[PDB]
């Protein structure tokens, strides 16, 4: 009966969420490669976007640190709460092959959407008031709005390649 937080994940991006899921589970495809269109770059893109429309000091750092918040929020969930058990092989693979590159970079945009899906659940166990949460969800939804807007040239799920039987040997 717990009154958990109800956050509407952008229905523009719901097809993409199901697509990503479909790829991993149903299509048996994995994302083993570093994307150039990465989370941090999109974060910066959004951060500068809010500044280019209206050059301000007061909202500048606001966007800046909220973006940094998404960064750290993503870092604390990426490999643990935002990953499938089938992505464990590719995780260790990419991590070993590119131990210099951050996971917020290599996993590209597709893995970004997962953050908002799990964050709403974890924030249900840490319930602040409606007002503080509202400002958080405000900027989160604002980001998601822009995210979905540019999503056509943002997300590339087509990089998911079907994992061969020999690759499955690292999942069993």
């Amino acid at each position: 009966s717990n009154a958990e937080v109800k956050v509407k994940i952008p229905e523009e991006l719901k097809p993409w969420l199901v697509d990503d899921w479909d790829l991993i589970t149903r299509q048996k495809q994995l994302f083993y490669l570093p994307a150039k269109k990465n989370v941090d770059s999109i974060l910066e893109d959004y951060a500068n976007y809010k500044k280019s429309r209206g050059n301000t000091d007061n909202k500048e750092y606001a966007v800046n640190e909220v973006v940094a918040g998404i960064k750290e929020y993503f870092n604390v969930m990426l490999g643990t709460q935002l990953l499938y058990k089938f992505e464990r092989p590719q995780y260790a693979e990419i991590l070993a092959d590119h131990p210099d590159a951050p996971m917020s970079q290599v996993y590209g945009a597709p893995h970004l959407l997962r953050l908002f899906v799990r964050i709403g659940a974890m924030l249900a166990y840490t319930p602040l008031d409606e007002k503080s949460l509202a400002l958080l969800l405000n900027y989160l939804h604002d980001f998601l709005k822009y995210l979905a807007k540019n999503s056509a040239t943002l997300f590339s799920a087509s990089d998911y390649e079907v994992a061969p039987p020999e690759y499955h040997r690292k999942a069993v």
């Binding site: 969420l17 899921w21 990953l83 997962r114 503080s132």
Partner: protein, 54 residues
């Protein structure tokens, strides 16, 4: 572990909270996040909205 300046909970949310007097809340309820390893799965409502929506 190393190169970790305490917690982001009091560097980012430091300003965010002080700007909103939300300090109270994030001081009483701090963010450690003992986040375990969990298979991401997907909420069924999204799946049915996309697939079974018609």
């Amino acid at each position: 572990s190393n190169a970790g300046r305490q917690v982001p909970s009091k560097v980012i949310w430091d300003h965010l909270s002080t700007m909103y007097d939300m300090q109270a809340l994030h001081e009483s309820e701090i963010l450690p996040f003992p986040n375990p390893e969990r298979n991401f799965v997907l909420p069924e409502e999204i799946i049915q909205e996309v697939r079974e929506g018609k």
